[PDB]
Design a protein around this nucleic acid. Sequence first.
DNA 1: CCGACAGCGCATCAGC
DNA 2: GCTGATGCGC
DNA 3: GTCGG
Length: 326
Amino acid sequence: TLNGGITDMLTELANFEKNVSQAIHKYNAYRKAASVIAKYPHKIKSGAEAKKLPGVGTKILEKIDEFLATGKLRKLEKIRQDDTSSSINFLTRVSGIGPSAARKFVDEGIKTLEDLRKNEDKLNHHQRIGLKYFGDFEKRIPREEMLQMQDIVLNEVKKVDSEYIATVCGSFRRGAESSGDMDVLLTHPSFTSESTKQPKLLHQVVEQLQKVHFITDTLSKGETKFMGVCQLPSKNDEKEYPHRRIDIRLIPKDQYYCGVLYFTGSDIFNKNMRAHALEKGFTINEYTIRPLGVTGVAGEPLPVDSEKDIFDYIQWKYREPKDRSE
DNA sequence: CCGACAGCGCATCAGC
DNA sequence: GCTGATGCGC
DNA sequence: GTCGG
Ligand SMILES: Cc1cn([C@H]2C[C@H](O)[C@@H](COP(=O)(O)OP(=O)(O)[C@H](Cl)P(=O)(O)O)O2)c(=O)[nH]c1=O
Ligand SMILES: [Cl-]
Ligand SMILES: [Mg+2]
Ligand code: NA
Ligand code: NA
Ligand code: NA
């Protein structure tokens, strides 16, 4: 909140570069800048002060001086006024519509929520569901509701096979008082790095959650990753809860620590951590941490028996999930 | 000045 | 049908 | 857009 106006501005610029310019490096640069400023514990008085932070360079420094002087940025003011950019930006807020589809729809004169609804036949499945719950997916999930959803998912999973372990990750595991969605990491001893001893491991779980009407819709589904929609049950006479996004990722049981580090995030925390790993001569994914040879070619997986082990390898002090919200 | 910027699952398409 | 590129998502 | 080398 200390530098909320600045980080909002940068986020708006990031979104512009992603959705309209389709300049993903500019997008990621703006988000990095916004992140480093958000955790900076002083109210920023100048661009030069902000430029001391890594990730803030000359251009963002100048923007920050304008914003501090006047409370706005002319570049953003003009972007806001531009119909095509505003339209493109809006359409990407539908799950499954990205920068390319958004611009394509705008070209055909499909540029409002109303246009989308009347042109449902021109959407793929993911987009159609994204449009169906557009309102709901805008809403945050209070932590108290996340606790209920967790109870339901862990108990239902236990009913399918008591050897499943389901772990809620994402912002929830980072201790947030509200989340954008629910992220569930799933393991079963039958699925390891070495073998898949039984099939349908993800399916049976999804099927059980569909059976008790917790999962209501599917955006995408594969053997290890489910992306869909869920809803808490409501009591008699009470308004229904909003429909929520849910992600479920099944990871080899012996690779749980790399898996839970990944799915706990944040996304920018993962990006910084993995970038750092590279500078230290390692590569990290949701399965393994591996050394980089002289080549650049990845070596064999290093042994890992905790999240801290991964931090150790790259010479980072351990950071608790709650300090990983970047 | 220049190249690199994290790493990967699922849906959809062109080409064969 | 398969393989690889592309889009969108985590 | 930023930064290390
Ligand atoms: C989008 C993304 C996610 N992840 C990892 C790290 C992420 O933490 C994890 C879940 O993605 P999420 O989109 O649900 O992120 P979250 O942290 O739960 C969000 Cl603050 P919210 O859902 O509360 O709004 O996946 C990445 O490693 N790279 C990414 O680009
Ligand atoms: Cl770019
Ligand atoms: Mg989440
Ligand atoms: Na800087
Ligand atoms: Na979208
Ligand atoms: Na998610």
